[PDB]
């Protein structure tokens, strides 16, 4: 009985929200902003090529000094690099070879990783005995493990195919919060600069915005057609960019709760594997199934300044804090530095 | 390398040592076979017992100088792709007793072993090990011919 009434209430709420969003759709981003010069042709080139991985690369992550890097691949290894001299600093062997993600601690003391084993592991770098050892193992998710990011030396947040996300306490080892509400497999997430919010995209084609402190769903976002593969976050703290399997990436602003602009081209009919921004928010960088990493603008919606060197699919790419370099890993087992 | 300090050369040496150890591991691990076991609902353990046998559960057996590692993802019986995101390069597949499996673009050239290549299993048919060994050797020969242009 109450089901029909609640359905009608949900329909009314949906109509109200749609009309509230339409009440502010003044014009497109392009129309108000015809005052922008294109950056022009942007050409980069391989300064350094990092060699040593023996299988496909699935994830990388920069250190916070803009000089050290961690990378993970299916040959069951986790390497730390010196990008100035191409030296190798550490190499860490993993228990399970079906990994999917990794992170580095903003202080320099810890790294993390995980995948199909349903566990997230934590590694201490600065020990008094001169090696790297495991500090923690987090257990309690039911599906596989997709993404993770330290907040400090004692707090990490982690997403799963359970249709759930969680917050942990590394000292004890328990979830201090859980976030339920999706329907399909959660696939990605990005932290805000102040580490007080986060975003996460899933298989059910939607997204949701979450608050760490309180712990309930705040906002949601529709606009794609297939599942969501990649999500990053813009420098303001108000934006985040998706990249999906319908061959599209999209931009947004949280305070206006409506999609703004797309990034597509008919010559590309593949899926986006990864995204990332640049300091000014003037260089969106997106990898693709079709072997080459494009370089998009942000406001004028129209360009792809290829970074073509790789002979297979691109999995992952990221830019430093000082903003002077870019790395890409690939299914061909190479890492490359660019500027 | 004449503009290197005394401390930069020590870093160079330990990087070289790391490279050596990585190459040894890779040479060791380049010669193992990975098999993805599949099957319908309770259509599978009958084979899993015959070869003397939360999370991905993976088994392990050896036979005639080939190192075999078999995996099972049968817990998820719903339409599965967030596991096919990561199994793209497997050597073969083993059934036990279909449109989505054999008619996908990433499995364009991926053979599949079948149990009722085809075979019949009985209670004392220990030849179920020789059969899978033979099939994988045939797959390997085709791979090598296709790589060196000779086919």
């Amino acid at each position: 009985s109450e089901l029909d009434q609640l359905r009608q209430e949900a329909e009314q709420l949906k109509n109200q929200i749609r009309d509230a969003r339409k009440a502010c759709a003044d014009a497109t981003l392009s129309q108000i902003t015809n005052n922008i010069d294109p950056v022009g042709r942007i050409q980069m080139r391989t300064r350094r090529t990092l060699r040593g991985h023996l299988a496909k690369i699935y994830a990388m992550h920069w250190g916070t000094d803009s000089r050290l890097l961690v990378s993970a691949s299916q040959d069951g290894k986790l390497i730390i690099w010196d990008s100035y001299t191409t030296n190798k600093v550490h190499a860490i062997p993993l228990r399970s070879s079906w990994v999917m993600t990794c992170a580095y601690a903003p202080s320099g003391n810890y790294v993390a990783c995980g995948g199909l084993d349903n566990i997230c592991s934590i590694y201490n770098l600065k020990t008094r005995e001169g090696n790297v050892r495991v500090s923690r193992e987090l257990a309690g998710h039911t599906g596989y493990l997709s993404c993770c990011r330290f907040l400090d030396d004692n707090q990490i947040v982690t997403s799963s195919g359970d249709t759930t996300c969680a917050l942990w306490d590394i000292e004890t080892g328990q979830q201090t919060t859980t976030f339920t509400g999706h329907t399909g497999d959660v696939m990605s997430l990005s932290l805000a600069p102040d580490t007080r919010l986060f975003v996460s995209g899933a298989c059910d084609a939607s997204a949701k915005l979450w608050d760490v402190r309180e712990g309930m769903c705040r906002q949601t976002f529709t606009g794609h057609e297939s599942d969501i593969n990649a999500i990053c976050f813009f420098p303001n703290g108000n934006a985040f960019a998706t990249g999906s399997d319908d061959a599209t990436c999209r931009l947004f602003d949280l305070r206006a709760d409506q999609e703004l602009m797309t990034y597509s081209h008919d010559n590309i009919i593949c899926g986006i594997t990864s995204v990332s921004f640049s300091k000014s928010g003037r260089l969106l960088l997106a990898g693709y199934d079709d072997f080459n990493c494009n370089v998009w603008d942000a406001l004028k919606a129209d360009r792809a300044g290829v970074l073509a060197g790789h002979d297979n699919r691109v999995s992952c790419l990221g830019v430093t804090d000082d903003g002077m370099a870019v790395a890409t890993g690939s299914w061909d087992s190479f890492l490359k530095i660019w500027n | 390398g004449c503009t290197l300090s005394a401390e930069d050369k020590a870093a160079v040496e330990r990087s070289k040592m790391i490279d050596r150890n990585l190459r040894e591991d890779g040479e060791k691990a380049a010669r193992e076979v990975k098999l993805l076991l599949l099957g319908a609902g309770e259509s599978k353990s009958t084979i899993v017992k015959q070869m003397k046998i939360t999370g991905i559960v993976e088994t392990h057996f050896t036979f005639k100088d080939l190192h075999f590692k078999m995996f099972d993802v049968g817990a998820q019986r719903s339409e599965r792709k967030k596991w096919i995101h990561c199994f793209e390069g497997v050597t073969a597949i083993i059934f036990c007793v279909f449109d989505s499996i054999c008619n996908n673009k990433w499995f364009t050239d991926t053979s599949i072993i079948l149990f009722l290549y085809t075979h019949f299993t009985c209670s004392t048919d220990t030849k179920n090990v020789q059969f899978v060994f033979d099939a994988v050797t045939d797959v390997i020969i085709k791979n090598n011919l296709k790589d060196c242009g000779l086919f």
Partner: single-chain antibody
């Protein structure tokens, strides 16, 4: 972590002797080792080197070709073999621990020593042989260089050690400005190329001894005379 070494005593002229060092508590095969000596009244003085991997070996110009350094990784022990001992070589000999990658701290653990008795390059000069001190007062020490220690890569390879009356040396400041782990935070040091000063705040007790400065820019490694605080 511990480093215990033995093999000392006294010998007749000519002669020979071997020394050894036993390690326990860390990963011995990823470190590089040194031997450092000290005459019964003078300062410290370096002897030899060997890398992690056994690829490089260095020797001091004073006794090069008449000593020998070697190791044994699977059982964690270090050796030095020396022959034809002269009347000068009477001193105490130490074993020191060291590791090099981007950001490591070298020279950060010393042993307990062992006594032996027998019957161009950069210069580093301590300011004053001894200074009178009073508790609670800020105090400062200084030594100086001949060449510039600053490199093109942007570092400055000068070191500071402290030795309390009756013990082994302890690392304080590495690469001229960085403070080692387990050291009270009241120390600090800086300087301009070829001129350097170590400074202490709120002078405590148990901070009596002799302060030393070492350079690590090119082999050989060289020491200063020492600067003793009196109390």
């Amino acid at each position: 972590v511990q480093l215990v070494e033995s093999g000392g005593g006294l010998v007749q002229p000519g002669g020979s002797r071997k020394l050894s060092c036993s390690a326990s508590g860390f990963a011995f095969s990823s470190f590089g080792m040194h031997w450092v000596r000290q005459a019964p009244e003078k300062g410290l003085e370096w002897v030899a080197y060997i890398s992690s991997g056994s690829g490089t070996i260095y020797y001091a110009d004073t006794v090069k070709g008449r000593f020998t350094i070697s190791r044994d990784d699977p059982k964690n022990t270090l050796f030095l073999q020396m022959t034809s001992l002269r009347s000068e070589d009477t001193a105490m000999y130490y074993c020191v621990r060291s590791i090099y990658y981007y950001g490591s701290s070298p020279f950060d653990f010393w042993g307990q020593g062992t006594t032996l008795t027998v019957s161009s390059d950069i210069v580093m000069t301590q300011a004053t042989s001894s200074v009178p001190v009073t508790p609670g007062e800020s105090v400062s020490i200084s030594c100086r260089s001949s060449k510039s220690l600053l490199h093109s890569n942007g570092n400055t390879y000068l070191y500071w050690f402290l030795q309390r009356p009756g013990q082994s040396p302890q690392l304080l400041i590495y690469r001229m400005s960085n403070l080692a782990s387990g050291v009270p935070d009241r120390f600090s040091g800086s300087g301009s190329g070829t001129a350097f000063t170590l400074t202490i705040s709120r002078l405590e007790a148990e901070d009596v001894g002799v302060y030393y400065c070492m350079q690590h820019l090119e082999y050989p490694l060289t020491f200063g005379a020492g600067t003793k605080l009196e109390l």
